[PDB]
Amino acid sequence: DLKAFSKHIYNAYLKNFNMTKKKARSILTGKASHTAPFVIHDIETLWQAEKGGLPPYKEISVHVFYRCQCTTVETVRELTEFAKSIPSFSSLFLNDQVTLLKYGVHEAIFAMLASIVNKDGLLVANGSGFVTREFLRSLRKPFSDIIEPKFEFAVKFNALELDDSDLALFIAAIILCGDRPGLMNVPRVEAIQDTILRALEFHLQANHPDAQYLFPKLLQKMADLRQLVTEHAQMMQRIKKTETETSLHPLLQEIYK
Numbered sequence: 125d126l127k128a129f130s131k132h133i134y135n136a137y138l139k140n141f142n143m144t145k146k147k148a149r150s151i152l153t154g155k156a157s158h159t160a161p162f163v164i165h166d167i168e169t170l171w172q173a174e175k176g177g178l179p180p181y182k183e184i185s186v187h188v189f190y191r192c193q194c195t196t197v198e199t200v201r202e203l204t205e206f207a208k209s210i211p212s213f214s215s216l217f218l219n220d221q222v223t224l225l226k227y228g229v230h231e232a233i234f235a236m237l238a239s240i241v242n243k244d245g246l247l248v249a250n251g252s253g254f255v256t257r258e259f260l261r262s263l264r265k266p267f268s269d270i271i272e273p274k275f276e277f278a279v280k281f282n283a284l285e286l287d288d289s290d291l292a293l294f295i296a297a298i299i300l301c302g303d304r305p306g307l308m309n310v311p312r313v314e315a316i317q318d319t320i321l322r323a324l325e326f327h328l329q330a331n332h333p334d335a336q337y338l339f340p341k342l343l344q345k346m347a348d349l350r351q352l353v354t355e356h357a358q359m360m361q362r363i364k365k366t367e368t369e370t371s372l373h374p375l376l377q378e379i380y381k
C-alpha cells in the first residue's frame with residue numbers, strides 16, 4: 125500500500141533526524157523561544173561559542189572545517205539509520221546498502237542543509253547558535269570556496285517551500301538511486317526508487333494543491349545536487365592534496381576513496 129509506504133518513511137524521518145524543518149524555521153524566525161540563537165560572526169564570538177574533542181588545533185579556518193566534518197559524519201549516521209528504517213532498503217544486500225549511502229549521503233545532506241539556512245547564515249549546535257554567511261565567506265581559500273556554493277543552492281531550494289513530509293520522501297529518493305557506481309541489484313533499486321517518486325508526486329498533489337510543476341522542479345533539484353556534490357568532491361580532493369595540516373575523518377576518506 126503506497127499511502128502506508130509514504131507514512132512509514134515519514135515516521136522514519138521523524139524518528140531518526142534530530143531537528144525538523146518546522147523546528148529550525150521557528151528558530152530562524154524567532155517565534156519559537158524568547159532566547160534567540162547566539163550569533164557567531166567573528167573570531168571572538170567563535171571563541172565565546174566554544175567556551176559555552178577534535179583533532180589538534182591548527183588554525184581558525186581549519187577549526188571550522190573540522191566542525192563541518194563532525195556535522196556531516198553525524199548526519200551520515202542518521203541517514204544510515206533512517207535508510208535502515210525503510211523495509212525496502214534493508215532487504216538489499218549489505219554491500220548495496222553501503223554503495224547507496226556512499227554515493228547518496230552528501231546529496232541528502234546538502235538538501236537537508238537548506239532547512240537550517242537562510243540568506244544570512246545557518247544554525248549550529250542544535251539551534252543554540254547561528255553562524256553568519258559573511259563570516260564563513262571571510263575564511264581563507266579553499267575553505268571559503270567549499271562553503272559558499274551550498275548557500276546559493278539552499279536559498280533557491282527553500283523557495284520551493286517544502287515541509288518535512290515532502291523532504292522525507294525527497295531524501296529517500298536520493299538514497300535509493302539506481303545510478304550509483306558499482307550497484308549489484310540495479311533493477312531492484314530502480315523499482316524502489318520508482319515507487320518513492322510515485323509516492324512523492326502523489327504526496328505533493330495533496331500537500332501542495334496550488335503548486336504547479338513542483339514535482340518536475342524537484343527532479344531538476346536532484347540533478348542540481350549531483351552537480352553540487354561533484355564540485356564539492358573536487359574541492360575536497362584539492363584540500364587532501366594541498367592542505368597537508370588538515371586531516372580528514374576516516375569515514376569521509378572512505379567516501380572520497
Ligand SMILES: O=C(O)CCCCCOc1ccccc1CN(C(=O)c1ccc(-c2ccccc2F)cc1)C1CC1
Nearest residue numbers: 188191192193195196233237248255270271274360376
Ligand atoms: O566532505 C565533507 O563532507 C566534509 C567537508 C564539509 C565542509 C563544507 O561544509 C559545509 C558547507 C556549506 C554549508 C555547511 C557546511 C557544514 N554543515 C553544517 O551543518 C555546519 C556545522 C558546523 C558549523 C560551524 C560550527 C561552529 C563554528 C563554525 C562553523 F562553521 C557550520 C556548519 C553541513 C552539514 C554539511
Ligand SMILES: CCCCCCCO[C@@H]1O[C@H](CO)[C@@H](O)[C@H](O)[C@H]1O
Nearest residue numbers: 216217218219220221222223224306
Ligand atoms: C552482504 C554481506 C557480504 C557482502 C560481500 C560483498 C562485498 O562487495 C564489496 O562491496 C563494496 C561496496 O559495498 C565494494 O566497494 C567492494 O568493491 C565490493 O567487493
Ligand SMILES: CCCCCCCO[C@@H]1O[C@H](CO)[C@@H](O)[C@H](O)[C@H]1O
Nearest residue numbers: 200204222225226375378379380381
Ligand atoms: C555508513 C556507510 C556510509 C559510508 C560508506 C563508505 C564506503 O566506503 C567504501 O567501502 C567499501 C567496502 O566497505 C570499499 O570497498 C570502498 O573502497 C570504500 O570506498
